[PDB]
Write a structure and sequence with these properties.
4 chains; Spike protein S1 (chain B); 3 helices; part of a larger assembly; binds 2-acetamido-2-deoxy-beta-D-glucopyranose; 3-stranded antiparallel sheet; binds a molecule of 2 linked components (NAG-NAG); alpha+beta
């Protein structure tokens, strides 16, 4: 509501189209080397035998201008088509589902999205999840028990200085280490970082 | 000597053979001349714009 | 002062380094305090405390909502060859005749562009097969979508944010053709998509 | 087109505002180039640094980390790449970001991904030892993390040997960087032919304005000047159109590169 100039892209599209149309209109008031920029006067002033020459000058100039305008329109259309394809993919992948590819829609872990309409485009509101309030801990990659290595099924081993817990990887929630959230593989003589517990 | 143009003229260290009159580099743009009255190699550089 | 970009007059160089304000070039830019110029600072500077037996685990979280704006269409236009380049003159038309079929191709190109614009909008918005509606009683576990859901009060069927967006941004042989989908239809698509994602999740896709 | 001829300037004055459009197109292209570089490289908010002690579980990133001894602060592979690949109204403007700033962005990205993993792409960077980050990345392709810890030395040796081979392949074999090379070649060819086009007669009596001006009276000197003007305008328009096409292609490539940076560097794909 308060800050303006936040919709730069659509405004730029509108302004570019308006400028192109305006210069095309204003190009009609040029001579291109003839004696006047108005056709009626040269028709009504001099002998046709050279009026064909003057009219030819006008004709070639205006054809040149029209052709240039058309080519610019083609280029801009290609660019807008690329943008529209991107928008369709974003609508398909972030509104109708949850995306895993990083930063494709929103900075952070994607939760969901909402669309809204704008005069010549779309506005996505991306809702994302951002962790905060970190803390320090001490970690080890495995646990020796009875000469066997133990690895966490899902999580990571941490310690607050005296005791060891296993947590998930994105939210501090310690739990006692148990034979139900860890699995065994071989004796612990080959793993670099094992600690006893 | 009938070769006209604008720019700044400085001293150059090129070495023409005893029968050239001037030089060019690429796209055929003159960049060095020999003055007839002294037979020394000058250097042409367009004066600045921007 | 003197730069790689050129020579700068009316500004004073400083040894500080802030975020870049008005990009001058070659790595330097300027700002106002009087007018000063300086070298860009790429950002802050921190050294994360690496060690081989230490990790950092978050204890809290925040939820953020951000915007992203994309254009999908431009105005469809058409141009009359003859009445533009001749302005209703017989002689000009007769002379133009012997140039062959040039501007038939121009009209073909412009028509292709307009059809492409309509196709663009159709592909972007017509992602759904039905038109879902939201229930009258709205208890979404304490979440509040009122600013986004359309309100029946005003005769626009648009939401608050959509009205703000629509307010923020504002012949010689040339014509402008109207778009195929009117704005109320586009708002209806957006409302359908949004009600579907609120009530059903991703299943309806 | 004119080259400081007042008669030519006045004659061209009546050809409408072609030249404002011609300049506007090139200005848009240049601004687009700056934006391309900005959005490809400025993916990070801070500038992370690597600690002085470098014990990453046996891996060896020396060939990739920056070398402070050199004045460019580049790395070995970057030096190999930079060494391997190598006025008539024309101006060349310098890019807004210098090579040192780009190298600093690259160093920050690489230090962050070594030290924190993927976490610095979401919020604040969180530290984690490298071995148990590679354990996570094994866990993400269907192999239990078990397998990593019991073959750590072998894996590290394979990684180091692969780095050595990539070093040698770049250092010795040439013709491996054809894309940047022929981009440069195409731009140079376009400028070269545009400049050489000024020697064309275009059906007039000569290719120099001074001779036409000092050879005959104004009345048909105007006709000859008109011939020159239309030929040169045609050439300029052709050049600008080709430039726009190539700019669109380069922008597509830049968008692909930005996506690859965001997905394969800041996370696992
Ligand atoms: C680390 O966490 C453990 C687990 O909570 C803490 O041990 C407990 O400390 C409280 C406070 O003194 C006692 O009431 C409990 O009886 C302790 N648990 C057990 C099993 O004895 C420990 O204090 C924490 N240490 C640090 C440095 O944070
Ligand atoms: C953790 O591992 C074992 C747990 O009992 C202990 O290491 C043993 O220490 C004794 C005394 O020096 C040796 O005779 C044994 O050979 C050790 N075990 C092994 C497998 O070598 C000790 O509590 C801890 N050891 C270490 C290295 O952390
Ligand atoms: C052309 O004429 C000039 C001047 O008339 C000659 O200049 C001579 O320059 C040398 C070296 O400075 C002097 O020692 C002579 O005294 C100059 N001669 C005269 C007559 O002034 C020059 O040599 C002549 N020839 C050429 C090929 O330049
Ligand atoms: C985790 O512990 C480390 C080591 O103590 C902290 O890193 C230092 O923290 C102190 C503040 O007590 C700073 O003055 C130092 O500059 C830090 N060193 C480095 C290399 O950054 C780290 O801040 C702790 N993590 C927290 C508190 O989240
Ligand atoms: C992490 O630190 C290093 C490897 O990064 C190793 O620890 C070393 O252990 C030896 C003897 O056991 C000590 O003399 C070194 O001072 C230790 N180095 C450091 C940096 O602490 C080991 O792989 C890991 N564990 C510990 C406890 O250091
Ligand atoms: C996580 O962050 C939230 C947001 O700051 C904390 O909620 C605040 O809690 C304090 C004390 O209870 C209140 O005074 C604030 O009003 C709360 N903020 C909001 C927005 O309601 C929350 O306490 C944090 N988590 C923990 C475990 O402390
Ligand atoms: C959802 O949020 C809106 C805010 O726009 C709430 O509407 C406000 O409600 C308060 C209390 O009834 C009124 O004082 C305001 O005038 C309302 N604002 C507008 C613009 O009408 C709405 O109440 C919230 N939803 C629920 C269920 O409480
Ligand atoms: C990482 O690999 C480099 C090789 O590129 C190692 O540098 C070599 O170190 C040995 C012994 O220190 C020297 O004999 C070689 O001359 C070095 N080569 C170069 C190119 O400098 C480096 O030591 C390795 N990293 C570690 C930690 O050992
Ligand atoms: C700024 O930096 C220059 C270059 O190192 C130094 O000579 C000068 O003393 C510094 N301070 C000021 C106020 O210019």
């Amino acid at each position: 509501s308060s800050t303006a100039s936040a919709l730069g892209k659509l405004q730029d599209v509108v302004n570019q189209n308006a400028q192109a149309l305006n210069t095309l209109v204003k190009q009609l008031s040029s001579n291109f080397g003839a004696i006047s920029s108005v056709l009626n006067d040269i028709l009504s002033r001099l002998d046709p035998p050279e009026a064909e020459v003057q009219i030819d000058r006008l004709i070639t100039g205006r054809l040149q201008s029209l052709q240039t305008y058309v080519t610019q329109q083609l280029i801009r259309a290609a660019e807008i088509r690329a943008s529209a394809n991107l928008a369709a993919i974003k609508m398909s992948e972030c509104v109708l589902g949850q995306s895993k590819r990083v930063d494709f829609c929103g900075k952070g872990y994607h939760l969901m999205s909402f669309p809204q309409s704008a005069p010549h485009g779309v506005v996505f509101l991306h809702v994302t999840y951002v962790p905060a309030q970190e803390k320090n801990f001490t970690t080890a990659p495995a646990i020796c028990h009875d000469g066997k290595a133990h690895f966490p099924r899902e999580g990571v081993f941490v310690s607050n200085g005296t005791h060891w817990f296993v947590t998930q990887r994105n939210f501090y929630e310690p739990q006692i280490i148990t034979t139900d959230n860890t699995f065994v593989s071989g004796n612990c003589d080959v793993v670099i970082g094992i600690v006893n517990n | 000597n009938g070769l006209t143009g604008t720019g700044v003229l400085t001293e150059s260290n090129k070495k023409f053979l005893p029968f050239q009159q001037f030089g060019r580099d690429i796209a055929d743009t003159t960049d060095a001349v020999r003055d007839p009255q002294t037979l020394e190699i000058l250097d042409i550089t367009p004066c600045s714009f921007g | 002062f003197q730069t790689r970009a050129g020579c700068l007059i009316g500004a004073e160089y400083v040894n500080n380094s802030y975020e870049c304000d008005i990009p001058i070039g070659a790595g330097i830019c300027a700002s106002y305090q009087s007018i000063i110029a300086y070298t860009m600072s790429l950002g802050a500077e921190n050294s994360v405390a690496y060690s081989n037996n230490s990790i950092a685990i978050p204890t809290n979280f925040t939820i953020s909502v951000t915007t992203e704006i994309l254009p999908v269409s431009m105005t469809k236009t058409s141009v009359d060859c003859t009445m533009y380049i001749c302005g209703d003159s017989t002689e000009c038309s007769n002379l133009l005749l012997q140039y062959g079929s040039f501007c038939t191709q121009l009209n073909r190109a412009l028509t292709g562009i307009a059809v492409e614009q309509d196709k663009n909008t159709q592909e972007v918005f017509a992602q759904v097969k039905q038109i879902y509606k939201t229930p009258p009683i709205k208890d979404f576990g304490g979440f509040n979508f009122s600013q986004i859901l359309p309100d029946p009060s005003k005769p626009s069927k648009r939401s608050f944010i959509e009205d703000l967006l629509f307010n923020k941004v504002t012949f010689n042989g040339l014509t402008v053709l109207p778009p195929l989908l009117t704005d109320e239809m586009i708002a209806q698509y957006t409302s359908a998509l949004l009600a579907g994602t609120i009530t059903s999740g991703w299943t309806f896709g | 087109i004119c080259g400081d001829s007042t008669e030519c300037s006045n004659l061209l004055l009546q050809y409408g505002s072609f030249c404002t459009q011609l300049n506007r197109a090139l200005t848009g292209i240049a601004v687009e180039q700056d934006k391309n570089t900005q959005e490809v490289f400025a993916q990070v908010k801070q500038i992370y640094k690597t600690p002085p002690i470098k014990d990453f579980g046996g891996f060896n990133f020396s060939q990739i980390l920056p070398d402070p001894s050199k004045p460019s602060k580049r790395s070995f592979i970057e030096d190999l790449l930079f060494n391997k690949v190598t006025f008539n109204g024309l101006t060349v403007l310098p890019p807004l970001l210098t090579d040192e700033m780009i190298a600093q962005y690259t160093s920050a990205l690489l230090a962050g991904t070594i030290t924190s993993g993927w976490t610095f792409g979401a919020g604040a960077a969180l530290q984690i030892p490298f071995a148990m980050q590679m354990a996570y990345r094994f866990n993400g392709i269907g192999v239990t993390q078990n397998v990593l810890y019991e073959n750590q030395k072998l894996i590290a040796n394979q990684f180091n040997s692969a780095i050595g081979k990539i070093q040698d392949s770049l250092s010795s074999t040439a013709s491996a960087l054809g894309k940047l090379q022929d981009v440069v070649n195409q731009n140079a060819q376009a400028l070269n032919t545009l400049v050489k086009q000024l020697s064309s007669n275009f059906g007039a009596i000569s290719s120099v304005l001074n001779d036409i001006l000092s050879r005959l009276d104004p009345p048909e000197a105007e006709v000859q000047i008109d011939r020159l003007i239309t030929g040169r305008l045609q050439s300029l328009q052709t050049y600008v159109t080709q430039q726009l096409i190539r700019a669109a292609e380069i922008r597509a490539s830049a968008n692909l590169a930005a996506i690859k940076m965001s997905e394969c560097v800041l996370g696992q794909s």
